[PDB]
Each structure stands twice: as structure tokens, then as C-alpha cells.
Amino acid sequence: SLSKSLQKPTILNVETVARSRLFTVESVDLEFSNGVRRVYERMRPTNREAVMIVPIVDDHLILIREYAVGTESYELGFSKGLIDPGESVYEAANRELKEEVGFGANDLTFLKKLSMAPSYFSSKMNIVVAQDLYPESLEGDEPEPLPQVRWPLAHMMDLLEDPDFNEARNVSALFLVREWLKGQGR
Amino acid sequence: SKSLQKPTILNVETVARSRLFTVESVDLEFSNGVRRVYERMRPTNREAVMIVPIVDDHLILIREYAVGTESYELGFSKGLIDPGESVYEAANRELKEEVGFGANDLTFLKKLSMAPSYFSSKMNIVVAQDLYPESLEGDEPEPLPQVRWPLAHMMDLLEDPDFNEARNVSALFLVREWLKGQGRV
């Protein structure tokens, strides 16, 4: 038969089937274009977005060490947080830097927006590069201080040899910033 | 300056369960005495695999429905590694189920975590070459349209929002780096 365009399935029903303090899982009844019915599960859709900041000062990246309960270990990577309602990406980035690393930035650049496993989650991550930093601290919600790690741009790619850093958002960010740095040749 | 001391886990408790999700509440005591109750997805040892097939200087991508964003993604074939399978074996089987091809040359490029703050799952990236026809039945509810994308313009994928997902992006850049190594550019 004739090749045809994509046709999204119709959502027959959506029901909350489990809720924790931070998670709300929904059961979604679907009917695909070919009439096949299936029940999928996903995290309740939200429009709350995240921001990840990549600070560069004196030819070094500023990374942080942060506990992750999912793996029960310390990850090495870029500062991340949520964009509060009403805030632009630049504003959330500046606020998160101040709260996590004690600096604000006069030069913030929005490089890319990414989704993460959209089959189950609808969250987006905005990658921002921060330069021309100045000291300024804000109170965050971290239970413990976030140790900072200065990493030379010239050896940026060595971060891929550290399993504590090898997380999809960190790796995507690393390569996107390097591409951007090439643009201006710095 | 003091060394890193992981918080101590005082208590773990299942607090919600769905068909595919089991959320745990974790009581923590950081080394500075601060106490917090974090929530996470029950830790698992099960791993995923993602395959990047290359044929005649082109990437083979697939379009697949994602209920979380209620849209069609454009990207690499992904699946779960079955217990007892190596990454190579899982990659070959998934290729077969999803694109109808097996591969004689499979290379394991990288292993990545995904939001370790709440999940503990790993994603293995495998490049597949020297393909041959061979189908296996998967459990997909509808066919997965295939899209051929030239290696010479692989970075243009970053201009398609249907493709811009952290795992696809990481794999794209890692495969490009690897291609450079064989002068495939």
C-alpha cells in the first residue's frame, strides 16, 4: 500500500496511578494509528524546565562535586538546577551559579535545549555558558557544600575518562561548549 | 579542605509503586550532620544499549513515539540488555528487532549514566557496521520508520528538535570523534 505520513496515537485516558513526595506516575491508554491499543506509564508532564551552567574563568571550566542518591556516589560535573516560574534561562542560570559556586556572570550564553528520555519524562534542560564572573553569593538548598574543580579547557576532553562525569547531560554539554569555543577559536 | 565522606543511609523505604516504577524514600545523614529525605527510583543493575548503524556512509535513524512528550522522536535505536547478554549481543538483537538488520562489526564506544541523582541505569553506546538482513520480532505497537542520514552532514541533526535528547546528542558526538580516528570525518 501507499507509503503514508506519521499519525500520532490518540490518548484515550490518563490516570494518576502512583504518587510519592517528588514523583507522580501516570498510566496512559493509547490507540495507535493502526488501531493497536496499549497502556503506557510516564511521569506526569510538567512545563518546569531545568538549567545547566558551564562557567569558564581563566581558561578553566568550573565543575562541582555533588552527591547523587540514585547511585550513592559523588558526581563530577556542571552545576544544574530548576528554572523558577517567571525566570528566563539567563536569570535562572545566574541565580543558580550564585547559589552553588558563589559567582554571578556578566556574560551568559544560551547554547542548547535538550530533552531527556522523552518516552517517560517531558523535562527539558537548558545549557548555558557563563563567563566574566564576579563574586556574589546566594543561599541555596544544598545540604552540604559543593566542592569546586577547575579543569583546563585545553584538556576538557579528558573529562570523558572519569566515570563520575560520564552522564548524558554532562557529556552533551561538554561537546556543545567545545563546538561553541571553536566558533570563536578560543 | 577535607575529603569527601558519603552521607550515611539511615533508612530506605518503598513509598510508591506502579507497573514500571518503584520509588524509594532515603533517609540521609551528611558528614556535616545535616539530615535529609531524598526520593529515588529503586536501584537496578539492568542496563540499556543504543545502536548507531552505519551503512554506505549514512547513519540509520528511526522515528519512534514517546508518550512523555507525546511526539515522535528522531534518533538511535535503543533497548534493554537481557540478563546474560553481552553489549554486542544486545545490540545485534535490538538492531534485528527494530531495523531488520544484524551487523558483523559491532564496536562498544562508551557507557553513560543518566541523571544519577534519581536513577542508577546505564546506557551503552554501540556502533554497528557491515550489516546484513535479518529480522526478529520486537514488541513495538507500530512500525519504526527508518531515516538515512549522511555521515558528512551528521552534525545537522542538532538542528532537529525531535533529535535533541541527551543520549542521542552524546552518541552523535562520540561517534563523530570515533570516526575521526579512522579518518571517516
CSV table of C-alpha atoms in Angstrom, one decimal:
chain,number,residue,atom,x,y,z
A,1,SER,CA,0.0,0.0,0.0
A,2,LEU,CA,0.8,3.7,-0.4
A,3,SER,CA,3.6,5.0,1.9
A,4,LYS,CA,1.9,7.3,4.5
A,5,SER,CA,2.8,10.1,6.9
A,6,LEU,CA,3.2,9.7,10.6
A,7,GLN,CA,-0.1,9.8,12.6
A,8,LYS,CA,0.1,10.3,16.3
A,9,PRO,CA,-1.8,7.8,18.5
A,10,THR,CA,-4.8,9.1,20.3
A,11,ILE,CA,-4.7,9.4,24.1
A,12,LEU,CA,-7.8,7.5,25.3
A,13,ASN,CA,-7.3,8.1,29.0
A,14,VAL,CA,-4.8,9.4,31.5
A,15,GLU,CA,-4.9,8.4,35.2
A,16,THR,CA,-2.5,9.1,38.1
A,17,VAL,CA,-1.6,5.6,39.4
A,18,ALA,CA,1.1,6.3,41.9
A,19,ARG,CA,2.4,9.4,43.8
A,20,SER,CA,5.4,10.0,46.0
A,21,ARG,CA,6.6,13.3,47.5
A,22,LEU,CA,8.6,14.1,44.3
A,23,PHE,CA,7.0,11.8,41.7
A,24,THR,CA,3.7,11.4,40.1
A,25,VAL,CA,3.3,8.4,37.7
A,26,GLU,CA,0.5,8.3,35.2
A,27,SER,CA,-1.0,5.4,33.2
A,28,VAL,CA,-1.8,6.4,29.6
A,29,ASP,CA,-4.2,4.5,27.5
A,30,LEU,CA,-3.3,4.8,23.8
A,31,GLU,CA,-4.7,3.9,20.4
A,32,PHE,CA,-2.1,3.9,17.6
A,33,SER,CA,-2.9,4.7,14.0
A,34,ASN,CA,-3.1,1.0,13.1
A,35,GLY,CA,-5.8,0.5,15.9
A,36,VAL,CA,-3.4,-1.2,18.3
A,37,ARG,CA,-4.1,-0.3,21.9
A,38,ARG,CA,-1.5,-0.2,24.7
A,39,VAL,CA,-1.3,1.2,28.2
A,40,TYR,CA,2.0,3.1,28.9
A,41,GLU,CA,3.3,4.7,32.0
A,42,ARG,CA,5.1,8.0,32.4
A,43,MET,CA,5.9,10.8,34.8
A,44,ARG,CA,3.3,13.5,35.0
A,45,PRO,CA,4.0,16.0,32.3
A,46,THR,CA,5.4,19.4,33.5
A,47,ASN,CA,6.5,22.6,31.9
A,48,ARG,CA,9.0,23.2,34.7
A,49,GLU,CA,12.4,23.4,32.9
A,50,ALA,CA,16.0,22.9,34.1
A,51,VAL,CA,19.2,24.8,33.5
A,52,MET,CA,22.8,23.6,33.5
A,53,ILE,CA,25.6,26.1,33.7
A,54,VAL,CA,29.1,25.8,32.3
A,55,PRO,CA,31.3,28.5,33.9
A,56,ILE,CA,34.6,29.4,32.2
A,57,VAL,CA,37.2,31.5,34.1
A,58,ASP,CA,40.9,32.0,33.3
A,59,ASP,CA,40.8,29.2,30.6
A,60,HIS,CA,39.3,26.7,33.0
A,61,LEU,CA,35.9,25.1,33.4
A,62,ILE,CA,34.4,25.3,36.9
A,63,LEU,CA,33.0,21.8,37.8
A,64,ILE,CA,31.3,20.7,41.0
A,65,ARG,CA,31.2,17.5,43.1
A,66,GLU,CA,27.6,16.6,44.2
A,67,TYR,CA,26.1,13.6,45.9
A,68,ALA,CA,23.6,11.5,43.9
A,69,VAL,CA,21.4,9.2,45.9
A,70,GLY,CA,20.4,7.1,42.8
A,71,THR,CA,24.0,5.7,42.5
A,72,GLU,CA,25.1,6.6,46.1
A,73,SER,CA,28.2,8.4,44.9
A,74,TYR,CA,29.6,11.8,44.1
A,75,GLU,CA,29.2,13.0,40.6
A,76,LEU,CA,31.7,15.4,38.9
A,77,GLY,CA,30.1,17.8,36.5
A,78,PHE,CA,28.3,21.0,35.7
A,79,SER,CA,26.0,22.9,38.1
A,80,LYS,CA,22.4,22.2,37.5
A,81,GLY,CA,19.0,23.5,38.8
A,82,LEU,CA,15.4,24.3,38.0
A,83,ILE,CA,14.1,27.5,36.3
A,84,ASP,CA,11.6,29.1,38.7
A,85,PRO,CA,8.3,30.2,37.1
A,86,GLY,CA,8.7,33.7,35.7
A,87,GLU,CA,12.5,33.4,35.2
A,88,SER,CA,14.3,33.4,31.9
A,89,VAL,CA,17.1,31.0,31.3
A,90,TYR,CA,19.7,33.7,31.9
A,91,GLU,CA,18.2,34.6,35.2
A,92,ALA,CA,17.9,31.0,36.5
A,93,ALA,CA,21.5,30.4,35.4
A,94,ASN,CA,22.8,33.5,37.2
A,95,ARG,CA,20.9,32.7,40.3
A,96,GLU,CA,22.0,29.0,40.3
A,97,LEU,CA,25.6,29.9,39.8
A,98,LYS,CA,25.5,32.4,42.8
A,99,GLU,CA,23.8,29.8,45.0
A,100,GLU,CA,26.1,26.9,44.1
A,101,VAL,CA,29.5,28.4,43.4
A,102,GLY,CA,29.5,32.0,44.8
A,103,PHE,CA,29.7,33.8,41.5
A,104,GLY,CA,27.4,35.7,39.2
A,105,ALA,CA,28.3,36.1,35.5
A,106,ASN,CA,28.2,39.2,33.2
A,107,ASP,CA,28.2,37.1,30.1
A,108,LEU,CA,25.6,34.3,29.8
A,109,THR,CA,25.0,32.4,26.6
A,110,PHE,CA,22.2,30.0,25.9
A,111,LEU,CA,23.6,27.3,23.7
A,112,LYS,CA,21.0,24.5,23.6
A,113,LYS,CA,17.9,23.0,24.9
A,114,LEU,CA,17.7,19.2,25.4
A,115,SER,CA,15.0,16.7,26.3
A,116,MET,CA,16.0,13.5,28.4
A,117,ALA,CA,14.3,10.2,27.8
A,118,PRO,CA,11.0,11.6,26.4
A,119,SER,CA,9.4,8.2,26.4
A,120,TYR,CA,8.9,8.5,30.2
A,121,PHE,CA,9.7,12.2,31.0
A,122,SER,CA,8.9,15.5,29.4
A,123,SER,CA,11.6,17.6,31.1
A,124,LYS,CA,13.9,19.9,29.2
A,125,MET,CA,17.4,21.0,30.1
A,126,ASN,CA,18.8,24.4,29.0
A,127,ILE,CA,22.6,24.6,28.6
A,128,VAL,CA,24.1,28.0,29.4
A,129,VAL,CA,27.8,29.1,29.3
A,130,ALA,CA,28.8,31.6,32.0
A,131,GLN,CA,31.8,34.0,31.5
A,132,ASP,CA,33.1,37.2,33.1
A,133,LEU,CA,32.3,36.1,36.6
A,134,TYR,CA,32.2,38.2,39.8
A,135,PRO,CA,31.9,37.2,43.4
A,136,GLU,CA,28.3,37.1,44.7
A,137,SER,CA,26.7,34.5,46.9
A,138,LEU,CA,23.1,33.4,47.4
A,139,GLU,CA,21.6,30.8,49.8
A,140,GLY,CA,20.8,27.5,48.0
A,141,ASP,CA,19.1,24.4,49.3
A,142,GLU,CA,22.1,22.1,49.3
A,143,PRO,CA,22.7,20.1,52.4
A,144,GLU,CA,26.4,20.3,52.1
A,145,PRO,CA,28.9,22.5,50.3
A,146,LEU,CA,29.7,21.6,46.6
A,147,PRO,CA,33.5,21.3,46.1
A,148,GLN,CA,34.7,23.1,43.0
A,149,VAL,CA,37.1,21.7,40.5
A,150,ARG,CA,39.0,23.9,38.0
A,151,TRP,CA,39.5,22.0,34.7
A,152,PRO,CA,41.6,23.4,31.9
A,153,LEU,CA,39.8,24.0,28.6
A,154,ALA,CA,42.9,22.7,26.8
A,155,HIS,CA,42.3,19.3,28.3
A,156,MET,CA,38.5,19.4,28.5
A,157,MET,CA,38.0,16.1,26.7
A,158,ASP,CA,39.9,14.3,29.4
A,159,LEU,CA,36.7,14.5,31.5
A,160,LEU,CA,35.4,11.6,29.4
A,161,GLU,CA,37.9,9.3,31.2
A,162,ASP,CA,36.2,10.0,34.5
A,163,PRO,CA,33.2,7.7,35.2
A,164,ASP,CA,31.9,10.2,37.7
A,165,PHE,CA,31.4,12.7,34.9
A,166,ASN,CA,30.1,10.4,32.2
A,167,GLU,CA,26.4,11.3,32.4
A,168,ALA,CA,24.5,12.1,29.2
A,169,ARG,CA,23.7,15.7,30.0
A,170,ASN,CA,27.3,16.4,31.2
A,171,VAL,CA,28.7,14.8,28.0
A,172,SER,CA,26.3,16.6,25.7
A,173,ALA,CA,27.2,19.9,27.3
A,174,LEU,CA,30.9,19.2,27.2
A,175,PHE,CA,30.8,18.6,23.4
A,176,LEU,CA,28.4,21.5,22.7
A,177,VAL,CA,30.6,24.0,24.6
A,178,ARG,CA,33.7,22.8,22.8
A,179,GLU,CA,32.0,23.3,19.4
A,180,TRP,CA,31.0,26.8,20.5
A,181,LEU,CA,34.5,27.5,21.7
A,182,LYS,CA,35.8,26.5,18.2
A,183,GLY,CA,33.5,29.1,16.6
A,184,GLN,CA,35.4,31.9,18.2
A,185,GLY,CA,38.6,29.8,18.2
A,186,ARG,CA,39.2,30.0,22.0
B,1,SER,CA,39.8,21.4,52.8
B,2,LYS,CA,38.5,18.0,53.9
B,3,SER,CA,37.9,14.8,51.9
B,4,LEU,CA,34.6,13.6,50.6
B,5,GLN,CA,32.6,11.4,53.0
B,6,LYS,CA,29.4,10.0,51.6
B,7,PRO,CA,26.3,10.6,53.7
B,8,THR,CA,25.2,7.6,55.7
B,9,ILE,CA,22.0,5.9,54.7
B,10,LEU,CA,19.8,5.6,57.8
B,11,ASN,CA,16.7,4.2,56.2
B,12,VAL,CA,15.3,3.0,52.8
B,13,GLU,CA,11.6,2.6,52.2
B,14,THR,CA,9.4,1.9,49.2
B,15,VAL,CA,6.9,4.8,49.1
B,16,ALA,CA,5.2,4.3,45.8
B,17,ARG,CA,4.9,1.6,43.1
B,18,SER,CA,3.5,1.5,39.6
B,19,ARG,CA,3.8,-1.2,36.9
B,20,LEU,CA,7.1,0.2,35.7
B,21,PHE,CA,8.2,2.4,38.6
B,22,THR,CA,9.2,1.8,42.2
B,23,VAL,CA,10.1,4.9,44.1
B,24,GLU,CA,12.1,4.8,47.3
B,25,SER,CA,12.5,7.4,50.1
B,26,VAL,CA,16.0,7.5,51.5
B,27,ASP,CA,16.9,9.0,54.9
B,28,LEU,CA,20.4,10.5,54.8
B,29,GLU,CA,22.8,12.0,57.2
B,30,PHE,CA,25.5,14.0,55.5
B,31,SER,CA,29.0,14.2,57.1
B,32,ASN,CA,28.3,17.7,58.4
B,33,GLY,CA,25.3,16.3,60.4
B,34,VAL,CA,22.6,17.6,58.1
B,35,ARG,CA,19.7,15.2,57.6
B,36,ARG,CA,17.5,14.9,54.5
B,37,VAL,CA,14.9,12.6,53.0
B,38,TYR,CA,15.7,12.1,49.3
B,39,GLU,CA,13.5,10.2,46.8
B,40,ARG,CA,14.8,7.9,44.1
B,41,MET,CA,13.9,5.2,41.7
B,42,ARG,CA,14.8,1.7,43.1
B,43,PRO,CA,18.4,1.0,42.1
B,44,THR,CA,18.7,-1.5,39.3
B,45,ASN,CA,21.6,-3.5,37.7
B,46,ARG,CA,19.7,-3.7,34.4
B,47,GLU,CA,21.4,-1.8,31.5
B,48,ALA,CA,20.4,-0.3,28.2
B,49,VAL,CA,22.0,-0.4,24.8
B,50,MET,CA,21.8,2.1,22.0
B,51,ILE,CA,22.9,1.3,18.5
B,52,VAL,CA,24.3,3.6,15.8
B,53,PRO,CA,24.2,1.7,12.5
B,54,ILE,CA,26.3,3.0,9.6
B,55,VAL,CA,25.7,1.7,6.0
B,56,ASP,CA,27.0,3.3,2.8
B,57,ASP,CA,28.3,6.5,4.5
B,58,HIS,CA,24.9,7.0,6.2
B,59,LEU,CA,23.5,6.8,9.7
B,60,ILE,CA,20.3,4.7,10.1
B,61,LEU,CA,17.9,6.5,12.4
B,62,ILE,CA,14.4,5.6,13.4
B,63,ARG,CA,11.2,7.6,14.3
B,64,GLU,CA,9.5,6.3,17.5
B,65,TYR,CA,6.6,7.6,19.6
B,66,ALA,CA,7.4,8.9,23.0
B,67,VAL,CA,4.4,9.3,25.4
B,68,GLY,CA,6.2,11.6,27.8
B,69,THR,CA,6.3,14.4,25.3
B,70,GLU,CA,3.5,13.0,23.1
B,71,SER,CA,5.6,13.3,20.0
B,72,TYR,CA,7.8,11.3,17.6
B,73,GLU,CA,11.5,11.3,18.4
B,74,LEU,CA,14.1,11.1,15.6
B,75,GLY,CA,17.1,9.1,16.8
B,76,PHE,CA,19.0,5.9,17.6
B,77,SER,CA,17.5,2.5,18.2
B,78,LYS,CA,17.6,1.8,21.9
B,79,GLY,CA,16.6,-1.2,24.0
B,80,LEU,CA,17.4,-3.2,27.2
B,81,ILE,CA,20.2,-5.7,27.6
B,82,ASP,CA,18.7,-9.0,28.6
B,83,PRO,CA,20.3,-10.9,31.5
B,84,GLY,CA,23.2,-12.9,30.3
B,85,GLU,CA,23.7,-10.9,27.1
B,86,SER,CA,26.9,-9.0,26.3
B,87,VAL,CA,26.5,-5.5,24.9
B,88,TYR,CA,27.4,-6.8,21.5
B,89,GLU,CA,24.7,-9.5,21.7
B,90,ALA,CA,22.1,-7.0,22.9
B,91,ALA,CA,23.0,-4.5,20.2
B,92,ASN,CA,22.7,-7.2,17.5
B,93,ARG,CA,19.4,-8.4,18.7
B,94,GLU,CA,17.8,-4.9,19.1
B,95,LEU,CA,19.1,-4.0,15.6
B,96,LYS,CA,17.3,-7.0,14.2
B,97,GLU,CA,14.1,-6.4,16.1
B,98,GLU,CA,14.0,-2.6,15.2
B,99,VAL,CA,15.6,-2.1,11.8
B,100,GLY,CA,15.6,-5.7,10.4
B,101,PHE,CA,19.4,-5.9,10.2
B,102,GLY,CA,22.2,-7.8,12.0
B,103,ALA,CA,25.8,-6.4,11.9
B,104,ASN,CA,29.1,-8.3,11.5
B,105,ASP,CA,31.1,-5.4,13.1
B,106,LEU,CA,30.0,-4.0,16.4
B,107,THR,CA,32.0,-1.6,18.5
B,108,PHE,CA,31.4,-0.6,22.1
B,109,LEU,CA,32.2,3.1,22.4
B,110,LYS,CA,31.0,4.3,25.8
B,111,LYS,CA,28.9,3.7,28.9
B,112,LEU,CA,26.9,6.6,30.3
B,113,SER,CA,24.8,7.2,33.4
B,114,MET,CA,21.5,9.2,33.1
B,115,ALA,CA,20.5,11.6,36.0
B,116,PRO,CA,22.2,9.5,38.8
B,117,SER,CA,20.5,11.7,41.4
B,118,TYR,CA,17.3,9.7,40.9
B,119,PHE,CA,18.2,6.8,38.6
B,120,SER,CA,21.1,4.3,38.5
B,121,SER,CA,20.6,2.9,35.0
B,122,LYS,CA,23.5,2.8,32.5
B,123,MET,CA,23.4,3.3,28.7
B,124,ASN,CA,25.9,1.5,26.4
B,125,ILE,CA,26.6,3.1,23.0
B,126,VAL,CA,27.5,0.6,20.2
B,127,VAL,CA,28.4,1.4,16.6
B,128,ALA,CA,27.2,-1.1,14.0
B,129,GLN,CA,28.7,-1.8,10.6
B,130,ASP,CA,28.7,-4.4,7.9
B,131,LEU,CA,25.0,-5.1,8.0
B,132,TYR,CA,23.0,-8.0,6.6
B,133,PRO,CA,19.3,-8.5,6.5
B,134,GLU,CA,17.8,-10.4,9.4
B,135,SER,CA,14.5,-9.8,11.3
B,136,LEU,CA,13.5,-10.6,14.8
B,137,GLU,CA,10.1,-9.8,16.4
B,138,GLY,CA,10.0,-7.0,18.9
B,139,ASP,CA,7.1,-5.8,20.9
B,140,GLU,CA,6.6,-2.5,19.2
B,141,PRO,CA,3.0,-1.5,18.7
B,142,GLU,CA,3.6,0.2,15.3
B,143,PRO,CA,6.4,0.2,12.7
B,144,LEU,CA,9.6,2.3,13.2
B,145,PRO,CA,10.2,4.4,10.0
B,146,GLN,CA,13.9,4.5,9.2
B,147,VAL,CA,15.7,7.6,8.1
B,148,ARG,CA,19.1,7.6,6.3
B,149,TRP,CA,21.4,10.5,7.3
B,150,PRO,CA,24.7,11.2,5.6
B,151,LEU,CA,27.8,11.0,7.8
B,152,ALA,CA,29.1,14.0,6.1
B,153,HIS,CA,26.2,16.1,7.5
B,154,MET,CA,25.7,14.2,10.7
B,155,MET,CA,26.0,17.4,12.9
B,156,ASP,CA,22.9,18.9,11.1
B,157,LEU,CA,20.9,16.6,13.3
B,158,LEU,CA,21.4,19.2,16.1
B,159,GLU,CA,19.0,21.4,14.1
B,160,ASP,CA,16.1,18.9,14.5
B,161,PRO,CA,14.4,19.2,17.9
B,162,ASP,CA,13.0,15.7,17.5
B,163,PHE,CA,16.6,14.5,17.8
B,164,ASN,CA,17.8,16.8,20.6
B,165,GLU,CA,17.8,14.4,23.5
B,166,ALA,CA,20.8,14.0,25.8
B,167,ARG,CA,21.6,10.3,24.9
B,168,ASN,CA,21.2,10.9,21.1
B,169,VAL,CA,23.4,14.0,21.3
B,170,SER,CA,26.1,12.3,23.4
B,171,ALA,CA,26.1,9.4,21.0
B,172,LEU,CA,26.3,11.6,17.9
B,173,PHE,CA,29.4,13.5,19.2
B,174,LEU,CA,31.0,10.3,20.5
B,175,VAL,CA,30.6,8.6,17.1
B,176,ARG,CA,31.9,11.6,15.3
B,177,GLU,CA,35.0,11.6,17.5
B,178,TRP,CA,35.5,7.9,16.8
B,179,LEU,CA,35.0,8.4,13.0
B,180,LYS,CA,37.8,11.0,13.1
B,181,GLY,CA,40.1,8.2,14.4
B,182,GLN,CA,39.6,6.2,11.2
B,183,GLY,CA,39.7,9.3,9.0
B,184,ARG,CA,36.0,9.0,8.1
B,185,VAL,CA,35.1,12.6,9.0
